[PDB]
From Swiss-Prot:
This is Thiol:disulfide interchange protein DsbA. SUPFAM superfamilies: Thioredoxin-like. The keyword Disulfide bond applies. The lineage of its organism: Bacteria, Pseudomonadati, Pseudomonadota, Gammaproteobacteria, Enterobacterales. It comes from Escherichia coli (strain K12). Required for disulfide bond formation in some periplasmic proteins such as PhoA or OmpA. Acts by transferring its disulfide bond to other proteins and is reduced in the process. DsbA is reoxidized by DsbB. Required for pilus biogenesis. PhoP-regulated transcription is redox-sensitive, being activated when the periplasm becomes more reducing (deletion of dsbA/dsbB, treatment with dithiothreitol). MgrB acts between DsbA/DsbB and PhoP/PhoQ in this pathway. GO terms for molecular function: protein disulfide isomerase activity; protein-disulfide reductase activity.
Length: 187
């Protein structure tokens, strides 16, 4: 039922110490927008994972020019402060839906209207911790030879292959995607 090359591929050099379930996304990515707002891929995968398996989500730079680097640093700020749930949707909608986020100051404004004080954002933005988080996201992308998003990796060894699943129907696609992660997570 689950064959290498159909629902998933296998990295030739597995990534030592990778997060068990690792998602890569970009706020510029249209498929990542639907994974968040329509398909809820992340919460559907989470419903089917075994006990205690942690899910990690990293932002990538190669979409959207110099604003893409700023969005990776902003996602680092969100992870450092734990405000992902308050900024994920306003950032997606400001980048892709309204296209009113076009600069670092527009990103900042999203965090402030979500309740993060400007002095707290500026401190985090310039911290060593966020510097380390930016480098961490870029290293994981390089370590899996990432070329596009959305992408999801299981135990640093298996890469989901959504174009090898049924993409004609949204509910079947979500169930095949989440069941593949569950199968691979038990390996
Ligand atoms: C039912 C459905 C099914 C879909 O199926 C996908 C899903 C993800 C991908 C991955 C992808 O888009 N990319 C970007 C290009 N590159 C270089 C990559 O490696 C990966 C593809 C099809 C997408 C949307 C919807 C909807 N509603």
């Amino acid at each position: 039922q689950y064959e290498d090359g159909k629902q998933y591929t296998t990295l030739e050099k597995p990534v030592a110490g990778a997060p068990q379930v690792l998602e890569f996304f970009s706020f510029f990515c249209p498929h990542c927008y639907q994974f968040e707002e329509v398909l809820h891929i992340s919460d559907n995968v989470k419903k089917k994972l075994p006990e205690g398996v942690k899910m990690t989500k990293y932002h990538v730079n190669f979409m959207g020019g110099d604003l893409g680097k700023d969005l990776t640093q902003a996602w680092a700020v969100a992870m450092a402060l734990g405000v992902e749930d308050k900024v994920t949707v306003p950032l997606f909608e400001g980048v892709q839906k309204t296209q009113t986020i076009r600069s670092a100051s527009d990103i900042r404004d999203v965090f402030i209207n979500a309740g993060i004080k400007g002095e707290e954002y500026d401190a985090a933005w310039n911290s060593f911790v966020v510097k380390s988080l930016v480098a961490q996201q870029e290293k994981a992308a390089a370590d899996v030879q990432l070329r596009g998003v959305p992408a999801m990796f299981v135990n640093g060894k298996y890469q989901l292959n959504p174009q090898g699943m049924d993409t004609s129907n949204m509910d079947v696609f979500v169930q095949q995607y989440a069941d593949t992660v569950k199968y691979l997570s038990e390996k």
